[PDB]
Amino acid sequence: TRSSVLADALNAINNAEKTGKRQVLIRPSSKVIIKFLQVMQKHGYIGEFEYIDDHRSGKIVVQLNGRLNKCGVISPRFNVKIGDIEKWTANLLPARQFGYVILTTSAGIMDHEEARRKHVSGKILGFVY
């Protein structure tokens, strides 16, 4: 089916952006996703993005920059311990600096560098660069 949501829309967003679409439309709207973008956005990777409701599981427009390089969903959703992310960054982030791996705790549908300032960890859904 559609067996999983976040995935489906994400992939189309790394298949809009590749071609230089300035944007996207994506179907099944969640909370999950709303939250996901709200992380991405804070970090300078998209803008605006103009929910639309239709009383349904609902559609979401995401205006572009042409920055996005790449935002795969991970995906069992594994478990993770604090000191373990130190394995991930370098197995899927080009650098270190930068470019956020990203995970789901309790607060928080929130990356790892903010995670230090909180000292928390659970399961790791997508990742950006």
């Binding site: 230089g20 679409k21 300035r22 944007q23 439309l25 103009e50 639309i52 239709d54 559609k59 427009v61």
Partner: protein, 81 residues
Amino acid sequence: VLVQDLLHPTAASEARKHKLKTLVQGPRSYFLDVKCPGCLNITTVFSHAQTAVTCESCSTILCTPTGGKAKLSEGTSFRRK
């Protein structure tokens, strides 16, 4: 096209595009207040019948069901709504 407002496009592009994509979905079918000539009565019929409905009781006939839209008889004002 490298870009476009898909929010609101043309009115065009909807009329033609398929019911289930105008973004927010909405039906095409719609209802249709019928004076058989004899009576003044006014029966609320649907554009896609499936049933022919009788008019009110006069026992009259109205509108045959086909693929999609009734074919209504001769008499019938069929003002829409």
